[PDB]
Amino acid sequence: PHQILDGENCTLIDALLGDPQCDGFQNKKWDLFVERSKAYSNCYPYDVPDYASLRSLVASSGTLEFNNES
């Protein structure tokens, strides 16, 4: 009934940013992003100043569709 998007060792912020091990989530819509406890990062280290706020904002948006701008 709900469009479930699996974690597959990916976080929502990593899929937002474009992790090379998370490139399969590009332009993907969901109704529930199920994050896994085995998730990690394999890119440049980063530190979001408001991580919970950004994560809740993207989860409430519920889409990863991205339009390139020149």
Partner: protein, 70 residues
């Protein structure tokens, strides 16, 4: 970045975000002693995104279509 200190001012008609980089040492993650702070800006219809950067900018490649749902 060819200058001693950068400065980033990403602002709209309804908000303003000025962030200065903090040069220093960090514990190494994946053999990287540097960090990246991730910020977000939301542009309403009729609003204008303006980006200033003397340096140290991790520039965006476009926009994510934020919406409201379940």
């Amino acid at each position: 970045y060819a200058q001693s200190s950068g400065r980033i001012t990403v602002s709209t008609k309804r908000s303003q975000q000025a962030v200065i980089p903090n040069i220093g040492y960090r514990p190494r993650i994946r053999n990287i002693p540097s960090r990246i702070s991730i910020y977000w800006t939301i542009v309403k219809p009729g609003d204008i995104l303006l980006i200033n950067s003397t340096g140290n900018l991790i520039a965006p490649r476009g926009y994510f279509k934020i919406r409201s749902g379940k």
